[PDB]
Design a protein around this ligand. Structure first.
Ligand SMILES: CN(C)CCCN1c2ccccc2Sc2ccccc21
Lengths: 213, 218, 110
């Protein structure tokens, strides 16, 4: 099969900037590459066909070049509406194949997360459950790591995480990390710590509480 | 103008099949190939297969031969894809698309059908208030609501009936056991809480659930 | 259908205008356009009443037409690749369906 490799996987861009990203095919496909834009929660949209041919209704700032194996999609001046995943696809021979995508991302100043930890509610404890929640809000870049500890000991079981998409206003990211235990298991320990590691600091942001307090 | 109309959602049991439709309009149906593309949550596009409506000649991604059956109904200008023996691996959005005339850029796309495969029954959420404990700082307090153990998606989380829109992060749902869980945080000035009321409103249409949880200290 | 020599029950349908066929990718569409003249423009079949239904008529019509086109092609020192046979199968299938409808219409007309 024709493998399509897109680079980079993620591209951080500043509004107005000219940006490019590449699609390379493992075999010669002439001009039989097509580019699609996919905004969050939307369908893909054709933006360039046959390497370089424009599509009606698509802003003229989009252009493509290349023939053979190496293909480039260029955006003359990147706008907020251009923030999306971009996929290439070849139609020269079966099977049709797609590149793994290039995600566009708005570049902003680095921001450390505001971290907040929450003990289990009494109403959850009444039902026998115990979820300790940690919010890591409004940080940049997207990459971040959360560790939980109970009485000093690390814990990864019963930890579920969830990440927001880049905020459209301030261009930051947020994450929630929830550690779920049983009431009895939760009663047998005192201290619970949410530990956030982010590139804005080599020091982890530690948020914790002690039950007996 | 050409349009490709697909059903929004399908909820389907593991091991069952689903047949999803793609109704075309605004052009001569038999003049253009139709294509089916899979997208797993947070993953890329995967070609499943394609069909020429003129004679129902098909081509498949090898992996989907035996899984995905492609047909059309010329009378109704509708393409169909039937997926069989569904598993959690088939939970995805499925797009149909149409190419050009003797050209194979996918010019028009349906809105996609989101398939969830699960044996879970409709379950209302347990909504837990997340209140801090005195040592909250910044001149700014973060409150939260844990929405746990519901099925299916979606839930709508608002704060104070939608009057609290700024400073809220409602995170995508995550599968915990075989039920969904999400949290919402709202960041608010220390004046306004607990002096004024902060309440999360969790609507779960599928179970006719509408829960208001006031965030109270301790 | 026209009968001659020793068709062993088979009949030759009248020549059909070659349709524009799209194969769903750039290479095959071009290949087909350039090579379509190498495939039959008429099909061989047994009388329609000798089959259970369309599918069985078509399946047979396709096999005999292609088999017999292949020996004549072989006699000329030419060969069909896997692509050729795939494409031939498709266009011959179309013609066999058309032939069935024509034949079954006549079968209904007394
Ligand atoms: C000149 N043609 C009438 C030959 C008959 C067509 N045909 C065929 C083709 C090539 C070799 C032998 C034969 S005999 C035959 C038998 C059934 C159907 C088609 C054909």
């Amino acid at each position: 099969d024709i493998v399509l490799t897109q680079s980079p996987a993620i591209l951080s861009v500043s509004p107005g900037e000219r940006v490019s990203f590449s699609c390379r095919a493992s075999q010669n496909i002439g001009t039989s590459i097509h580019w699609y834009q996919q905004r969050t929660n939307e369908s893909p949209r054709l933006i360039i066909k046959y390497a370089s041919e424009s599509i009606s209704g698509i802003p003229s700032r989009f252009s493509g070049s290349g023939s053979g194996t190496d293909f480039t999609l260029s955006i003359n001046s990147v706008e907020s509406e251009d923030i999306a995943d971009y996929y290439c696809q070849q139609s020269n021979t079966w099977p049709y194949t797609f590149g793994g995508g290039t995600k566009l991302e708005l570049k902003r100043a680095d921001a450390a997360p505001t971290v907040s930890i929450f003990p289990p509610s009494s109403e959850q404890l009444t039902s026998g459950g115990a979820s300790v929640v940690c919010f890591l809000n409004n940080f940049y870049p997207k990459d971040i790591n959360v560790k939980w500890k109970i009485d000093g000991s690390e814990r990864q079981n019963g930890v579920l995480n969830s990440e927001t998409d880049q905020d459209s206003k301030d261009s930051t990211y947020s994450m929630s990390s929830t550690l779920t235990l049983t009431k009895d298991e939760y009663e047998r320990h005192n201290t619970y710590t949410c530990e956030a590691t982010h590139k804005t600091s080599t020091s982890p942001i530690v948020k914790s509480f002690n039950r007996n307090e | 103008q050409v349009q490709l109309q697909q059903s929004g959602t399908e909820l389907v049991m593991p091991g069952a099949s689903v047949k999803m439709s793609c109704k075309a309009s605004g052009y001569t149906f038999t003049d253009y190939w139709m294509h089916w593309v899979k997208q797993r949550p947070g993953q890329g596009l995967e070609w499943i297969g394609s069909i020429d409506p003129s004679d129902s000649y098909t081509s498949h991604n090898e992996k989907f031969k035996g899984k995905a059956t492609l047909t059309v109904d010329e009378s109704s200008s509708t393409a169909y894809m039937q997926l069989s023996s569904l598993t959690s691996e088939d939970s995805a959005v499925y797009f149909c698309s149409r190419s050009g005339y003797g050209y194979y850029a996918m010019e028009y796309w349906g809105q996609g059908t989101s398939v969830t495969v699960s044996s879970a029954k409709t379950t209302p959420p347990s909504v837990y208030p997340l209140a801090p404990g005195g040592g909250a700082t910044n001149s700014m307090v973060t409150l939260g609501c844990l929405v746990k153990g519901y099925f299916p998606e979606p839930v709508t989380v608002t704060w104070n009936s939608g009057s609290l829109s700024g400073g809220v992060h409602t995170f995508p749902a995550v599968l915990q056991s075989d039920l969904y869980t999400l949290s919402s945080s709202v960041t608010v000035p220390s004046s306004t809480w607990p002096s004024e009321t902060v309440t999360c409103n969790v609507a779960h249409p599928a179970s006719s659930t509408k829960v208001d949880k006031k965030i109270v200290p301790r | 259908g026209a009968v001659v020599g020793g068709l062993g029950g088979y009949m030759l349908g009248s020549a059909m205008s070659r349709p524009m066929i799209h194969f769903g990718n750039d290479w095959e569409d071009r290949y087909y356009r350039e090579n379509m003249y190498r495939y039959p423009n008429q099909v061989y079949y047994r009388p329609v009443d000798q089959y259970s239904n369309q599918n069985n008529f078509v399946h047979d019509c396709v096999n005999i037409t292609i088999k017999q086109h292949t020996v004549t092609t072989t006699t000329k020192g030419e060969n069909f690749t896997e692509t050729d046979v795939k494409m031939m199968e498709r266009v011959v299938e179309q013609m066999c369906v058309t032939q069935y409808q024509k034949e079954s219409q006549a079968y209904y007309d007394g």
